[model samples]
Target: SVFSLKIDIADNKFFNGETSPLFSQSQAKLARQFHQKIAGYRPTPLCALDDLANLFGVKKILVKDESKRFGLNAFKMLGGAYAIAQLLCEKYHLDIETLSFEHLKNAIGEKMTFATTTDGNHGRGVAWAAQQLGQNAVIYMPKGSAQERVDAILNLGAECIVTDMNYDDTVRLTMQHAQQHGWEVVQDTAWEGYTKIPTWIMQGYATLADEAVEQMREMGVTPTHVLLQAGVGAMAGGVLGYLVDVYSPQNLHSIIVEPDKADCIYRSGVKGDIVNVTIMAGLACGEPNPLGWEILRNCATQFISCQDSVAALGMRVLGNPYGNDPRIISGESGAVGLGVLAAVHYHPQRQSLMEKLALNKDAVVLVISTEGDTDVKHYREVVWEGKHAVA
Candidate 1:
């Protein structure tokens, strides 16, 4: 059912909840500066959904429209490009604090090949970054990935290989190939021995959060609740890490939303440690990034595992707005948090869920639409054709 949602209130058992230095304002400043140096870079729109807020019984609803991000149609590039630039800085012995795109683009050095596995957006991000720096990229996709996603990466002049396995096995393949070819894997997930690049990738995501905070200030509204959707939780962790730092978790109620099939963070909140058919294609993952998991365990107030129909409802609602609320072309993965909000307003357990989530008429919410129609055909099916209807 579209209204199906499982809530897991975070225990915050290990809640140091201390703001990480990586997500500090200074690091974000450098990240934003580096992005500004990129050609065609511009901050994405932050839409004020005032009408929707009124309809949903919230004081304000601010949605960061990342579909407009960098003309890449997804926010993943912010991390990939920044991480690639930092790598270039490291190899050239240039201080990253002072590194600029123009400086890195013109530096003479052996061109490095960046490699990674992605369902769609992340690979394209890595490819786009590599293309900008005149370096090569090798992208691997798991079985069942859409043809459009593979073509998107290929169009960037990156070599893309679709593997005969699932996402986890595809990641293994990417690492194996990278090892054999001496390529650098710029994945968003981190492991025991591989934390630096993933940390950098996560840090890169801070640029958008920084922009959102400034935008919120300009709008003269402080969000009381922030909603985030997690895949491996890199974006969730990165943005939440920054938000929790700016507005302490005590003052902010942050929610991490995930597709039930890929609800790693939600499952983690159930104990610690951490699916199959999910319409949120970009969010179809079975594992969590440890770096992100740590931040979420500390700062996120609630975790939600919801069904695909909820996401479809959010896409339809955001695309076809009520009154004067600006339209957001959010894809499945992008719309889940807003989806959860919609369900809270319409669900049978509305009051109980509302109380559980601390949502009320006085609440002001922040949500990120992480991507737009990344899978156009499927998006049309859900948004236009009424696929996955709530019933």
Candidate 2:
């Protein structure tokens, strides 16, 4: 318990406080260990599109598709499962494999419960792990979350609380209720009372970058730019932390994209401090958690926040023949990178971002379609069927 607490403190201080050389070394070691432990998994494919490149006026564009990750169909499993395993290892002296999911559940007994705010994806991942390991899981969701997501959580036997609120409001409810229940909130956002659970989640994402590095190496060249999306920035923090240390300068350019409505990172960079805002309609609709902001401030070189309409159009573009994947489904929030790519590809916005980023025809850009068609109805009506509904 003390060890876990110490690790939590170290990770929190490392990101929320000044950069430490020793802490960097420790994280490097931990990243290496994470990479080594997950040796059997194949690096995900990086699918490229000539049309997007030509249209964007960039050298190349690649999609780091996480749809087929470890047979889980989404990247959420990477962060949640890895964090859960780490927690299990910390609680039990045995290695992860030796500790069966049932054993871990029994060991933690009633004490091991995870509460979190999710938009279907993160909550589902946590619920999956909770079921596998027998831990009690509580997921808080906005009132309008889809039935499919609610069913997925219920199938896993995890408690689901739906509130008449947005993502941020859901988070407040989770925190308030979690405190009352004494459940460990494995939230992916950092705040005053808690930061470790989120950091652990981020560090788990290091495995993704490690896989990316190996995948790039196999492709004969490392990518020149990486376009990653941000909500509260937990996933981006993990990717940035691992990539910044391992593949700095020549390997990849950190490109962070968010919704203009909730462009806290963009606003923070502009305002010279973390920005607090609430517009919970799209991906960038929440404030930048402080720890995530600190990591972005250190590692990210270019940040793009596009207007809501652009991302809405981007969903259409991604669903269209331009990207060439009939299965390529990006929700309004999911299409932020596609929007950034489109802006940089043709519009006058291209020049502004171009002058900031050295992206030319030869540069190789990578974007992650983080969540698949998690929003099924929207995917069917807007993306697949070519019809618009609620917006």
Candidate 3:
């Protein structure tokens, strides 16, 4: 069933009883060590949204801006670059802390080729990592992928191909050919027998959560709720896992958001089965990454599936924020958290949802602007011309 907005509180009955920490402090420390060594590595902005908080009836709202992560416009670089280095260190017996991208490149010397599939950000991240490490890469994207996204990956010295298939099909085929060509698939999503690298990827994203915590501490406030967007649930899982492990445990209210058409995580949470579907380009996936799902199914307090109009509204709102508020140029995928929040706050039929989530005048909320204007043309059309279906 199509829905403009859907929300479901997670039941503890689906709990896998997996107690292993998804974002361990040890792993976060390792990720921080590796990431700090990379050029242009710094904590992205954690901007307070005072105006939005007022508008939404929340006591506070904070948006972690990841638009400038490692010179990449998206946070996927945290995972992509770190995983690449980790894999290289594993292959060459090098120290992750001491290894530089330049030296790592020279040491590899055409010995490794990494490949991945993406709608945009992850592939760009992988390609950027490969280019920095002086390795080759092949990137495959699903149909309806934006041209600018393909161009960005190509500019990173990677071969980019647009496949005429759905996101899941593209991922499957990319892995198939990657295996055939002996190319290492440094994908963000995880499945059986391939959980190792993706685990590293999820761990890499812990840096974002760690930084968010420190930044929030600087503001002298703890987050009460976090709204995270899910593609394959890697980022959401990582952030949720980190918050649960490091901060509030069962006290923090976490919301998982996704496009209604491709809300696999939400569907999986509801059906207790792997659900695959397609909608938004970046978020279009038929299955939740089993590894990520393991953490999210247990920790996420609620799930939201929304229509493209919600994303359009979010992009517009961020681009032209309330007076004197900082303007945030968030991409469609990146702005989904804000979009879902706006919908719950303002939509006539969603008052119960707002109350259900306790979005009152005392609630502190956190949302992540996961990307910038990755597709400039499409972003303009969506943010300015009211076009929501850019993908």
Positional deviation of residue 121's Cα in model 2 after best superposition, in angstroms? 1.4
Minimum summed lDDT over a 10-residue window in model 2 is located at 1-10
TM-score of each: 0.94, 0.82, 0.94
Candidate 3 lDDT? 0.81
Ranking by lDDT: 1, 3, 2
64: Cα error in model 3, Å: 0.7
Clashes of each: 0, 2, 2
Whole-model lDDT per candidate:
0.84, 0.66, 0.81
Give the distance in Å from residue 61's predicted Cα in candidate 1 to where it truly belongs: 0.7
**For model 2, what is the C-alpha lDDT against the true structure?**
0.66
Candidate 2 pairs with clashing backbones: 56-345, 59-361
Candidate 1 lDDT by residue in tens digits, 30-129: 7888888777878899999999989888898899999998778899998998898888878867776675655545767688999999998998999998
Q: lDDT of model 1 at residue 194?
A: 93
**lDDT score, residue 50, model 1?**
91
Give candidate 1 misplaced runs (Cα > 4 Å). 1-16, 97-109, 274-279
Q: List the pairs of residues colliding in candidate 1.
A: none
Worst 10 residues of 1 by lDDT: 272-281
Lowest lDDT block of 10, candidate 3: 1-10
RMSD of each: 2.3, 8.5, 2.9
Q: How many clashing pairs does model 2 include?
A: 2
